[PDB]
Design a protein around this ligand. Structure first.
Ligand SMILES: [Mg+2]
Ligand SMILES: [Mg+2]
Ligand SMILES: [Mg+2]
Ligand SMILES: [Mg+2]
Ligand SMILES: [Zn+2]
Ligand SMILES: [Zn+2]
Ligand SMILES: [Zn+2]
Ligand SMILES: [Zn+2]
Lengths: 171, 173, 171, 173
């Protein structure tokens, strides 16, 4: 069977970097891959070309008979139907690697990532450097600008990575 | 802060064994612990330590003391999803939490409480079992072999086997 | 090929316990094993029956054509010829699991364990609870009774596990 | 105390890449670092950071400051085995040390300096490469394909390939 590896953690933790490392492993082995990201900028960069898609059901079109690995970034933004699509790929012998956030900036679970963590054969929790104390112990994201909304695409203009004690102090 | 470690995997994969190893670590260090299991058909034993048997996660609070350093919770799949917020509060108070539970039902649906705790976790340990069909150390699923289709159904080897994905798919055909 | 897993750390770190866990995995799978310990008490207990042997060369006698795993405890006490004997087993498709101390109580390397760490496919460093501070951070063994000699079979009557800061404080 | 992390494995397995990831972690935290590589045919680059090029491990001491928090050493197989005692002293002073180097020569003999550092390590990270022969992510060995039999012989892909054990044994036959 295929194996599912889920890469998760807060922002700035190297999730996309690790996902791309796995893509390179497969390419070096001359194993066919399919790389996806949710919706139009086709670049996965921390780069490889990715298929930008709205729904997990759309992945089927791009998966060929000798596809060996499927790589999906920003999984927290996909519909939870991703769980059954991924189960089907594993059942077909295809390895799947997913990267995405585990928690929102308000420490609520991202549903789709949670479901994939339950299906995973391997889970890699990534850490970041804490923006406040500088230790390699950041497991949370704190929102520093913009509104309080939990869906808000952005980078350093809106978000920092913090450890739990720094998150609680700053709040 | 406290750290959350979630130990998960199918049946027979050594989850309670690992949870008990962590309880021993804290006890050896003379750190106070609190150990919990759900009420649903007092010892946590892999084959063991005594545990508080509780219904609601919020009941843990009755047993957590000022100097409690570690909280250990077995069979987390059977707790109400409010366990997520109870655990977060413990971590914020500097208490380390170790949870063990199944990730997937025998139908390969997520156990939602375990899934929420995986989201919160600082460290996730996926455990494997020996596959009942092929003997490889590659079993990641549980298959139900007696007792009807219910996903909440307490039992052991009379009811459930650990299998790898290929073997699960073979046996289901 | 076979894979080599080396389990190392100070005393009281669960090395033998982990080695026995792997033995059980193989037995549950109905895979033939051969279990060795250096020299006459044939028990490996933290139990399974072990072959008690003087030299690594003696392992050959006990290894059958359908042996799938070889398990060796207290490797620090074996001759460094163990490195080539283990390489040969891996070459034959046999998995090997070794447990042993990495450092003496004087923080000198055990030669045989060092050589096996270089050959290993996987290394598991085990920790103990520090006898002094109670944290799960002990990586060293300190000798508390008997003489200063570096070869001295014993348990709690002679040795404690400590973290690096506690070792330095106590010395 | 400081902790020692040793990253090891055959060529092409991402050892320097991982070492550089750790250097970045410390730099992001505004922690002073000291980075070293051996003199033997200034940048550490995986493809990078500037490094002090030194002969003897004891030369590191010239560059380590009062507020140095992390020491990073690449190609440790090429250093004198006294590196073991130099590193122990750094750990005792509270300085974290990260070493990357080959575990085995192309003849599958141990690199002794790496072996000593593996003994001392708090954490060991064995890295794998893609096998040049079969394409699986299972290469744990390096095989020499040009340049005579010497075990101290600087070079890259013109001289060395990463292989799995079965492929190494096949190619050697
Ligand atoms: Mg990303
Ligand atoms: Mg259990
Ligand atoms: Mg032992
Ligand atoms: Mg390098
Ligand atoms: Zn912080
Ligand atoms: Zn199976
Ligand atoms: Zn201590
Ligand atoms: Zn190969």
């Amino acid at each position: 069977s295929g194996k599912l590896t889920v890469i998760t953690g807060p922002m700035y933790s190297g999730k996309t970097t690790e996902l791309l490392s796995f893509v390179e492993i497969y390419k070096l082995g001359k194993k066919k891959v399919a790389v996806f990201k949710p919706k139009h900028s086709t670049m996965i960069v921390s780069g490889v070309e990715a298929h930008v898609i709205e729904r997990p059901e759309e992945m089927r079109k791009y998966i060929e008979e000798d596809t060996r690995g499927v790589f999906i970034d920003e999984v927290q933004f996909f519909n939870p139907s991703l769980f059954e699509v991924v189960k089907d790929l594993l059942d077909r012998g295809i390895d799947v690697f997913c990267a995405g956030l585990d928690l929102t900036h308000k420490q609520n679970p991202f549903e789709t990532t949670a479901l994939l963590l339950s299906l995973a054969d391997t889970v890699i929790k990534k850490k970041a450097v804490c923006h406040r104390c500088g230790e390699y112990n950041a497991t949370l994201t704190l929102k520093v600008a913009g509104g309080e909304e939990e869906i808000d695409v952005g980078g350093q203009e809106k978000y920092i990575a913090v450890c739990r004690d720094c998150y609680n102090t700053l709040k």
